[PDB]
Amino acid sequence: MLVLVLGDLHIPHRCNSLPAKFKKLLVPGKIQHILCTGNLCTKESYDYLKTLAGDVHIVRGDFDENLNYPEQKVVTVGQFKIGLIHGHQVIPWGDMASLALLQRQFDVDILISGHTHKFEAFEHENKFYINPGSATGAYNALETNIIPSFVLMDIQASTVVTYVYQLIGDDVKVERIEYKKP
């Protein structure tokens, strides 16, 4: 089981495609699940996601024209109950206490959110929080040096290894973080 976590592409509003090297890495038949935080913001990007994996889950971003996407989603992948939301709903934006408030509501082991365009992966109160950032590296008013990034989760029973891919200059660079459920 491995899960691609990405979002805030903002195509065509702020970007026109994923960077060159990301389109090369992201190709069919390698990834089982995709959890997407939203702001695609169109079918052209959706249908591209639909040919990367069978099971693709998407929540509604603030600029998605599609209403059929739910506000939030909880899905289970192995032992982890995972929570998905775009994060424009979480006020103040990117606030820890508000994000944990939302973890208690869904009752999830991992919370994925993405309104900030800023990658974050960390444990807090024995519970895990992912923000994949913007996979296109899209403009945000509140953060000026946006690094194009996505996340690959490698789930095995009661453990998760999250890998963060980042486009720094021309180079794709990877870091790894590991969370075990109590």
């Binding site: 491995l2 992201l26 390698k30 690959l152 490698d154 890998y163 891919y165 794709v172 990877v174 790894r176």
Partner: peptide, 12 residues
């Protein structure tokens, strides 16, 4: 510890 930019990654 570094990792390759591949899917999935591998170690150095």
């Amino acid at each position: 510890e570094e990792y390759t930019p591949t899917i999935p990654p591998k170690a150095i």
